[PDB]
Write an enzyme that holds these catalytic residues in place. Structure first.
Site: not given
Ligand code: HEM
Ligand SMILES: *[C@@H]1O[C@H](CO)[C@@H](O)[C@H](O)[C@H]1NC(C)=O
Ligand SMILES: *[C@@H]1O[C@H](CO)[C@@H](O)[C@H](O)[C@H]1NC(C)=O
Ligand SMILES: *[C@@H]1O[C@H](CO)[C@@H](O)[C@H](O)[C@H]1NC(C)=O
Ligand SMILES: *[C@@H]1O[C@H](CO)[C@@H](O)[C@H](O)[C@H]1NC(C)=O
Ligand SMILES: [Ca+2]
Ligand SMILES: [K+]
Ligand code: NA
Ligand SMILES: [Zn+2]
Length: 595
Positions: A351, A110, A190, A188, A184, A186, A258, A105, A108
């Site tokens: 999931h 990122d 984020s 990285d 992004t 990539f 979440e 997750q 995912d």
């Protein structure tokens, strides 16, 4: 007229182009094409969008319009018939920890995020959707089938809004609707630092020139740090327990709270950055705050990259790893670094790996207090259980010592997600991830199973017997044929996940190809890939080869005993070792002297 002239909602930058750091937005990664991989543009189309009316209406919208001469089954009807199950006995992965799930997750989050159409920021259009189940504009509600137990308990539908789409104001020409990736492409980190410049700033500690990330100032975990609170109201994290009144965390990614095991991971990451930044200040006390921030952000980036490709992917892809991701051969700027629309569905295999309960464990890895095991559903938008009930260590021990749920053709997605998901806008532990995932496939113009089977150079079943041969499951193929009439129409999320798992992996053939190709491209087209020469020094790289998740925990918790291989199934104490025996990140090679 080929068109690279739409994608309105983006920050418009000029490229330094000789910086040794990634942008926040993902811009400038591909010099010949600055915007490739950047956030707030269209997902890539590996195949064209398939819409009811060629342009924008999802298959299932018009109750008369077929797909290939058949009506598309209700999303909630597919969920009910095929994806639900009752018995959590024997459902668990015997050779994957909950960490296996949890990293899924994170990776995912990122790579891709396809935000729901806002319009309503306080709205009567959300009223027309939720209370009146009225399909129109961005409301594309999930109607309950007949017999549905939610019919009696909730109403006629679950509300659903369509994904955001490029040019909220297109280029006035005539093209198919394309969903935005707000992160992004990539790998990285984020999800820690932001993909939008302004948030990325608010996340930082600018009061000190130490290039730290901002930490909570009201709460501490026995000296260790919590993420700042998202002070935006109304808070779904306050709503699930108004007594506690603990908001959601603020992260590089919207979705960080979440669930509590996702919030924990985000806590681990932010800690490692402050730690990285602090160790870099000792070695190089002349480095400014910016250098500090970027140099740690640069390491934290490679860390995610290393763990994803070295430890995670081989145990998802199994026998297919080498076939799709061979030994790296250097940055190829001809490779599309963009995440595909289909990928954002291919990765949702995670999931079928989330189990029904989460556990807090004491320092002996035994049940921490009376309410040690909790149903998953109590833990969506749950920040209070960290802040007011033990910190992240008891959840982290649960990550190591507990298992992921195995994907089972008879037991696909636990009721905690299928019947009781919470959504940040709505007030009820009452939604269906499986039904949403399928509503989303149609929202996003996804071609069908056989389209993707074909795209991956796999046989495309057309009959009962054909599909029975692909799934090796007479009953499961039957329930599918009765719902969809033709494998052609099987929505891709159930399609790929319905396949049995390749040798030594946790996805089936079609998924292995969709995921395999994507991860191959996220690597080869990344100019800041960690193994790309010049990005790191040869020695910095020798250094980085030694990172583990075991270490990340050892350095960012008061946990003392961890496994070596944190992703396989680990039982305490046989499979646990003192932290002192675990390899560290030698930061000596980042020492920079002017003499
Ligand atoms: C709650 C949720 C989880 C666990 C308790 C969970 C878990 C995963 C794993 C383990 C994933 C990958 C290995 C993964 C990927 C993606 N998810 Fe999913 N997830 C939970 C909740 C959600 C919700 C809610 C959504 C949004 C559904 C919608 O369509 O509105 C969701 C999506 C995704 C997703 C798509 C991302 C995108 O590009 O938009 C994954 C790739 N998850 N989850
Ligand atoms: C679990 O999977 C790992 C993956 O590397 C493998 O090496 C190990 O032998 C497996 N253990 C089992 C099946 O118990
Ligand atoms: C920023 O850093 C300073 C100095 O290290 C620290 O005392 C302060 O609490 C930090 N502020 C935030 C909001 O993290
Ligand atoms: C809310 O939090 C309090 C402590 O702050 C706890 O004792 C109580 O059980 C919680 N309520 C719910 C609904 O989880
Ligand atoms: C780089 O990618 C292109 C386009 O997919 C491919 O044709 C080419 O062989 C690759 N070049 C090298 C040297 O790997
Ligand atoms: Ca990213
Ligand atoms: K696609
Ligand atoms: Na998500
Ligand atoms: Zn402690």
């Amino acid at each position: 007229s080929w068109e690279v002239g739409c994608g309105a909602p983006v920050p418009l930058v000029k490229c330094d182009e000789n910086s040794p750091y990634r942008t926040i937005t993902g811009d400038c990664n591909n010099r010949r094409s600055p915007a490739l991989g950047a956030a707030n543009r269209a997902l890539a189309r590996w195949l064209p969008a398939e819409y009811e009316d060629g342009l924008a209406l999802p298959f299932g919208w018009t109750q008369r319009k077929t797909r290939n001469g058949f009506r598309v089954p209700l999303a909630r009807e597919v969920s009910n018939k095929i994806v639900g199950y009752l018995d959590e006995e024997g459902v668990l992965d015997q050779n994957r920890s909950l960490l296996f799930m949890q990293w899924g997750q994170i990776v995912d989050h990122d790579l891709d995020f396809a935000p729901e159409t806002e319009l309503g920021s306080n709205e009567h259009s959300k009223t027309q959707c939720e209370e009146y189940c009225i399909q129109g504009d961005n409301c594309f509600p999930i109607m309950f089938p007949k017999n549905d137990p939610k019919l009696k308990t909730q109403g006629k539908c679950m509300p659903f809004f369509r994904a955001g789409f490029v040019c909220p104001t297109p280029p006035y020409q005539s093209l198919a609707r394309e969903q935005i990736n707000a992160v992004t492409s990539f790998l990285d980190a984020s999800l820690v630092y932001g993909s939008e410049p302004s948030l990325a700033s608010r996340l930082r500690n600018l009061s000190s020139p130490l290039g730290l990330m901002a930490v909570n100032q009201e709460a501490w975990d026995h000296g260790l740090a919590y993420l700042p609170f998202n002070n935006k109201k109304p808070s779904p994290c306050e709503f699930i327990n108004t007594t506690a009144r603990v908001p959601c965390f603020l992260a590089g990614d919207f979705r960080a709270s979440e669930q509590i095991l996702l919030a924990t991971a985000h806590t681990l990451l932010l800690r490692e950055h402050n730690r990285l930044a602090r160790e870099l200040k000792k070695l190089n006390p002349h480095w400014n705050g910016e250098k500090l921030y970027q140099e740690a952000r640069k390491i934290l980036g490679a860390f995610i990259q290393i763990i994803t490709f070295r430890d995670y992917l081989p145990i998802v892809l199994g026998s297919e790893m080498q076939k799709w991701i061979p030994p790296y051969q250097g940055y190829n700027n001809s490779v599309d670094p963009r995440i595909s629309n289909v990928f954002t569905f291919a990765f949702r295999f995670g999931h079928m790996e989330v189990p029904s309960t989460v556990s807090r464990l004491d320092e002996n890895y035994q049940p921490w207090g009376p309410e040690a095991e909790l149903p998953l559903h109590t833990l969506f938008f749950n920040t209070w259980r960290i802040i007011k009930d033990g910190g992240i260590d008891p959840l982290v021990r649960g990550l190591l010592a507990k298992k992921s749920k195995l994907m089972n053709q008879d037991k696909m997605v636990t009721s905690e997600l299928r019947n009781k998901l919470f959504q940040p806008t709505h007030k009820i532990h009452g939604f269906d991830l499986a039904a949403i995932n399928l509503q989303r496939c149609r929202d996003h113009g996804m071609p069908g199973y056989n389209s993707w089977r074909g795209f991956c150079g796999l046989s495309q079943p057309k009959t009962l017997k054909g599909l029975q041969t692909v799934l090796k499951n007479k009953i499961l193929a039957k329930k599918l044929m009765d719902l969809y009439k033709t494998p052609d129409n099987i929505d891709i999320w159930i399609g790929g996940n319905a396949e049995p798992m390749v040798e030594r992996g946790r996805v089936g053939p079609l998924l292995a190809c969709l995921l395999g190709r994507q991860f191959q491209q996220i690597r080869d087209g990344d100019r800041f890939w960690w193994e790309n020469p010049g990005v790191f020094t040869e020695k910095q790289r020798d250094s980085l080869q030694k990172v583990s998740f075991s270490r990340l925990i050892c350095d960012n918790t008061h946990i003392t005993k961890v496994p070596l291989h944190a992703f396989q199934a680990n039982n305490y104490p046989h499979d646990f070792v003192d932290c002192s025996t675990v390899d560290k990140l030698d930061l000596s090679p980042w020492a920079s002297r002017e003499n």
